[PDB]
Amino acid sequence: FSETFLWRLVSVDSEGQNTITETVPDTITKWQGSMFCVSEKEGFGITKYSANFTSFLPFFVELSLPYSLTREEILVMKAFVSNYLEECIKIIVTLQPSADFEVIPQDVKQDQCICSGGRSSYSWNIIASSLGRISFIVSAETTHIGASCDGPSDQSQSTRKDTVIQTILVQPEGIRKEETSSNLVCVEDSNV
């Protein structure tokens, strides 16, 4: 669960039509809202039926990766794409090529006709042929043909874009060794 993203202590003016304007965080949960509302003239009444709010995305893309990797090790990436639309849709997923790390072409390509409450397990072959921090970028085009598969989408959707960054840290095999040599200079208009 996330944090309470609104905590203001606003006051009521005139009859009372106050509008709290806030920004919702990334957590996908419920948003029950309540208050207590004092006034020196009358008192305070806590709300009885709290207000309900929901945040969700029609399209989920998720990557699960280990924290670190060893130099020159073939790792498989698992990209999960989830569809929550009422219509069964198709999806194509692409990986951005880069020179720092090599990506082995798996020669795998299927446009699964995913539907409501469904998820895929697209995978690719990755070699840790680099050093340091490496960024992985996934992409989607969401070519769908909304009405199941045979029925054309027509004017149902235009484009859903979901790209997420991911971080990996590959390190040379072995143990981390360090040697430090601290020096102090006491110079009075002299050069060392």
């Binding site: 699960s64 990766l65 280990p66 990797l69 060893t70 090790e73 073939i74 790792l75 498989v76 698992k78 095999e173 072995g174 143990i175």
Partner: protein
Amino acid sequence: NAVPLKTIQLSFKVLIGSRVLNVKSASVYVYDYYETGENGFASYSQPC
């Protein structure tokens, strides 16, 4: 707390997260807290 001359064995289990092939070795580094000079190193390999 301490490691005397007699050998002491420790053991624990580990599950699997993201699968990876051609896994290389790993390191076990043991060292006294107040004296880093008296330290030892050992190798770790996949049982399979």
